[PDB]
Design a protein around this ligand. Sequence first.
Ligand code: HEM
Ligand code: HEM
Ligand SMILES: CC(C)(C)C(=O)N[C@H](CS[C@H](Cc1ccccc1)C(=O)NCCCc1cccnc1)Cc1ccc(-c2ccccc2)cc1
Ligand SMILES: CC(C)(C)C(=O)N[C@H](CS[C@H](Cc1ccccc1)C(=O)NCCCc1cccnc1)Cc1ccc(-c2ccccc2)cc1
Lengths: 446, 446
Amino acid sequence: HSHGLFKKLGIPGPTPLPFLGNILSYHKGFCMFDMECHKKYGKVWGFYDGQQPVLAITDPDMIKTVLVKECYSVFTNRRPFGPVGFMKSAISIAEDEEWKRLRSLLSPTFTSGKLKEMVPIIAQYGDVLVRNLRREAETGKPVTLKDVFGAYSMDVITSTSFGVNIDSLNNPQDPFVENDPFFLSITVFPFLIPILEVLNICVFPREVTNFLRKSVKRMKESRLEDVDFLQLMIDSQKALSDLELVAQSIIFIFAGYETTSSVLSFIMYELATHPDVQQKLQEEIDAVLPNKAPPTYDTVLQMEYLDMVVNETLRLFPIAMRLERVCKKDVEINGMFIPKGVVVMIPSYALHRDPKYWTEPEKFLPERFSKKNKDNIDPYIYTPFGSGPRNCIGMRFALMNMKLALIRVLQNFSFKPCKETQIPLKLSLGGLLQPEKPVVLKVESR
Amino acid sequence: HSHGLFKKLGIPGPTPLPFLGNILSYHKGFCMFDMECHKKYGKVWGFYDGQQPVLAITDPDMIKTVLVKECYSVFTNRRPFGPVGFMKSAISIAEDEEWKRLRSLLSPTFTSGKLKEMVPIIAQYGDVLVRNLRREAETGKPVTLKDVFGAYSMDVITSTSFGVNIDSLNNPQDPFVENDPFFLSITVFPFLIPILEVLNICVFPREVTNFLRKSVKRMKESRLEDVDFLQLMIDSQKALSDLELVAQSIIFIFAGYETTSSVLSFIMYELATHPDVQQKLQEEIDAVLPNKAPPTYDTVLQMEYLDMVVNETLRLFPIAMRLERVCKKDVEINGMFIPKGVVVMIPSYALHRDPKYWTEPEKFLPERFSKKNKDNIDPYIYTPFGSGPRNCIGMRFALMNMKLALIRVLQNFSFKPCKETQIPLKLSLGGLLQPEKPVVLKVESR
Ligand code: HEM
Ligand code: HEM
Ligand SMILES: CC(C)(C)C(=O)N[C@H](CS[C@H](Cc1ccccc1)C(=O)NCCCc1cccnc1)Cc1ccc(-c2ccccc2)cc1
Ligand SMILES: CC(C)(C)C(=O)N[C@H](CS[C@H](Cc1ccccc1)C(=O)NCCCc1cccnc1)Cc1ccc(-c2ccccc2)cc1
C-alpha cells in the first residue's frame, strides 16, 4: 500500500517490491543509487524506503523553497529516526517549536566572536599534532590519517566542549572517544520502533550516554563554582533543561569528531595525489604565516587557496550525502504538488557530481572555487552544510577547526602516497561516506 | 515511566501500577471510577491508562477554556484510537485541519432548515412504530424496548442517510443493522497499534464497511442520475472525496442508531417508573396535537415538558460519559499548567450527579429543567452533547428524532412496568452506558 503514490502523481521512479520498497537498490550504496536515478529519471523522481515515500528534487529553485522559503511552514523537520530515548531532545532530532527554541538557544555558541575565542585552544592540540606526527615521520612508516586525525579531532572536542584536556592517541585509556542490518529492518518494520522505545532500547548505547550524563553533571557542579561549549550552555539556562544539555553535548561531541577527522583525511588524500596543489597551498601558508608563524583567527580567513582546497574536497566528498525534510502539509511548490507525509530529499552527493553544473566532475580541481569562478556556483547545487534555517549550525566552527589543523600540519610536513595507498580512492559501498580502505600516506619533515 | 508526572505537578490521583496504570480500577466501570475519584481527590486529579496521562477537570471555567476557548489552539483533538484503517477520515476521528474541513463541509447537513425537511420522512416510521407496537400490545406480552426502538432507530437512519426504506424489525433479512479484553490490551500495548494497522486489521469489521462502500458507490451512481444525508454530501463535493464520503456514512449510521435507541429506552424506563410524568407529558401532547394530530417541526419545538423530560434523562444517562481533548502544547489554563501530551477529560456522568450542582442527583425530577430553574444550570456541568466547536454535530437531529418518536408513541400507548422489569435500573458495569439487563415494559392501548 501507498506504493501507488508516485504512479498517481505522474512522478517517475523505480518500481517497488512489496514490503521492501526500493531498499534492495541500496546494494551499491546511497550515493550510487541517487546518481543512477538522476540519470534515468530526470529532474524529479520518487522511491520508497519500506512504505515511506521519498521525493528527490534537483531543481535549485525548488530546493530553495524547501530548505529556505517554506522551511518554517512546510519543511521544518527531518525524517523520524528511532528508537532514540532521551535523545529526542537533541537539536538535530528535535522538531517544530522544540527545535526552534533549541536552535535559538544554542545559536549564540557558534558566533564568530565566540569562535574567535576558541582559536588559542584549538591551537594547542595543533602543536600536539605536529609533535606526534614528526615522531611517526622519523619512523619512516606509512601513516593512518583517520587515527592521527581522529585523535586530533577528539582532542579539540573535549577541550572545546568540556575543558577535558587529553592527548587521546597517547592517552587511549581515557576514552572520551568511546563512540547495517538493524536500521534496514527498522525501515521495513517502522511499526516496531514503539516496541523498542517502551523497552528503553536506544540506537545510542546506554553506557556511553550514562557516562556522559553523570560526567556532565560532575562538570556542571564542579565549575559551579570555580570558554567551552558547556560554559555557554550553562550560562544560557524556555531556558535549557539539565538533561537537554546532556543531549546537546553528545551531538556536538560526535559532530566535531567524525565529521572533522573524516574530512581532514579526504583532504590529505587529495593533496597527496595532487602534489602541485599541496606545494601551492604550502606556498600560500608561508606567505601569510612566515617563519612558521602560528595561525590566528584573522590569518586563517585570510587564506583563499585554503578555502578552495577545503571547498573542493567537500564537493567530491560531502559527508552528509543527502539533505532531507518531511512535508507536513499538502503543498504546491514550483508547480508541483507534494502531499503531507512525503520525505523531500536533496541528493547532495549526486548534485555535486552533475556534469551539467560541473566540468569534469570526477576531478579534484580547486580552481572551481577561485574568486573568478565561484560566482558561477549555484548555492543550492553545492550544499555541503545544507542551507536555510536548519543548515549545519557548526559550519563556522568546522571550517575553522580543519583549516587551523591544515595550516599547522602542512607548515611542518609534506605527504606522499605509499604503495599500499589506494589510488583511486574507492568509497565505502556502505551507508557512510567513508573510504573502502582506510587512507595511508607517507609523511616527511620539511 | 511517565508515571511520576502528576506526582511532579502536585496533582493528586490514584497511584499507578507498572505497565497497567490505573486500568485495574475500571473493574466497576468508567463512571464509578470517575465518581470515586472526584469524591476523594477534589476539583482536579490525574490517572494513567497504561502509560497515558489523563487529567480530569471539573471546574466549569476551566472546562470552557478547553472545550470552547482554546479548542482551536490547544485542545482540538480526541485521544488516538486505533487500528482504524480508512476510518482515519471519519469526522469524529479526524484531527486538526482535516477535521476542520470535514466539520465545515458536513456542518450544513444539520441545519434547522434541512432538519425541518426531514420531518415528514421521520414521521413515516413513527407510524410504522405505533402499528408494530399495538400488535405486540394486543399480545399482552412484556416488550423489549431496545429492539422495537433499535428497529425504529435503524428505520430512520436508512431513510435519512440513503433513502433505503425498510421495516427493519419485520424485515430482519435486509440487515443494514449489521453493526472488552481487546481495547485494554491496546491501552497497555499502544506500541502494537502500528502492528495491526500495517496488517489492515481494523476495529471496524471489514465486511460491514466493504458492504457499505460498494453500497454507497451504487447509490452515488444510481442517483446520478435520477433529501437524505448522502444527497447533501453528494452536492458538497478541498471538497469531499469518494472514500471520505463512505467514512462519514458509517459514523452517521451508528450515531443515529445506538444513541437514538439507547436514549429512547432510558426515557421510557423513567416514564414507566414515574407515571405522573407520563400522564403530564401525555396531557401536554394532546394539548398541542389534539385528535392525535401528527407532530410537525413547529409543534415539537412547541412542547416544553417534552424537553424537560428529554433533558433530565440525558442528565441521569449521558451516553457519552466522558468528554476528552488532547493537549497538543504546553499551556497554563486557569492557573494550572498542562503539558503537551496529556488527555484532558471532563467527567460528564459524574458532573451530572454532583450534589453540589444538583439536588437529589439520583432522582428523575424533570422540574430541574423547568423554565424557572434552567437558568440555574451551568452549561459546562451539563454537557450531554459536549460544547464548543467540536460538540455533537447531530444534536439538533437527535433531539428532534427522539421527540418525534416520543410524541407518536405516547399519543397511542401508555407504558407500565412488569414483574421482570428491573427496578431500580442498574447500569452495565462494562464500558458502555447501557443497562445491566435489557429494559422490558408492559404496553397498553389508549
Ligand atoms: C566538515 C564538517 C561538517 C559538515 C560537512 C557538516 C554538514 C552538515 C549538514 C549537511 C547538515 C544538515 C543541513 C541541512 O539539513 O540542511 C548538518 C547539520 C548539523 N550539523 Fe554539521 N557538519 C559538519 C560539522 C559539524 C560540527 C563541527 C558541528 C558542531 C556542533 C555540527 C553540528 C551540526 C548540527 C547540530 C546539525 C543539525 C542542526 C539542525 O538540524 O538544526 N556539524 N551538518
Ligand atoms: C442522544 C443522542 C446523542 C448524544 C447524547 C450525543 C452526544 C455526543 C457527544 C457528547 C459528543 C462529543 C462532544 C464533545 O466531545 O464535546 C458527540 C459527538 C458527535 N456526535 Fe453525537 N450524540 C447523539 C447523537 C448523534 C447523532 C444522531 C449524530 C448524527 C450524525 C451524531 C453525530 C456526532 C458526531 C459526528 C460527533 C463527532 C463530531 C466531532 O467530533 O466533530 N450524534 N455526540
Ligand atoms: C547531519 C546528518 C548526519 C546528515 C543527519 O542529519 N542525519 C540524520 C539525523 S541522525 C544523527 C544521529 C547521531 C548523532 C550523534 C552521533 C551519532 C549519530 C545526527 O543527529 N547527526 C547530526 C549530528 C552530527 C553531525 C553529522 C554530520 C554533520 N553535522 C553534524 C539521520 C540519519 C543518519 C544516519 C543514518 C544511517 C547511517 C548508517 C547506516 C544506516 C543509516 C540514518 C539516518
Ligand atoms: C462521541 C463518543 C462516542 C463519545 C466518542 O467520541 N468516542 C471516541 C471516538 S470513537 C467512536 C468510533 C465508532 C464510530 C461508529 C461506530 C462505532 C464506533 C466514534 O467515532 N463515536 C462517534 C460516532 C457516533 C456517536 C456516538 C455518540 C454520540 N455521538 C455520535 C473514543 C472511544 C469510544 C469508545 C471506546 C470503548 C467502548 C467500549 C469498550 C472500550 C472502549 C473507546 C474510545
